[PDB]
Amino acid sequence: TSGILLASITGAGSAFQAYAGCYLTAFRNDPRTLTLRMDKTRGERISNVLVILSGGALSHAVEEVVQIAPGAVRNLATLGASTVQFLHN
């Protein structure tokens, strides 16, 4: 239960370093979804990000693995969470 509050992510987007050399932008285009665009990885290889959603409607955190190429997008439901963190899987 650490991260940025989802309420602080807007349609404009915010950029994160998930782990060394791996950068992504998160956008919140509606209150139910989080859109992740992969921006850069070491060697431009497929990412290996762990997304952790917590708080809010969630009594316990939920995690999702995101393995996508730079330039690709992953949409995920936020499940009423308050908080999100990006880490290395």
Author numbering: 4 to 92
From the publication, what sentences describe this entry?
Plant pathogens secrete proteins, known as effectors, that function in the apoplast or inside plant cells to promote virulence.
Here we demonstrate that both protein pairs contain a ToxA-like family member (Avr2, SIX8) and a structural family 4 member (SIX5, PSL1). Likewise, SIX8 and PSL1 are adjacent divergently transcribed genes in the Fol genome, and we demonstrate here a physical interaction between the proteins. Manual inspection of the top 5 models (top model shown in Figure 4C) demonstrated that the thiol side chain of a free cysteine in PSL1 (Cys 37) and SIX8 (Cys 58) co-localised in the dimer interface, suggesting that an inter-disulfide bond may mediate the interaction. We crystallised and solved the structure of SIX8_C58S at 1.28 Å which confirms its inclusion within the ToxA-like structural family.
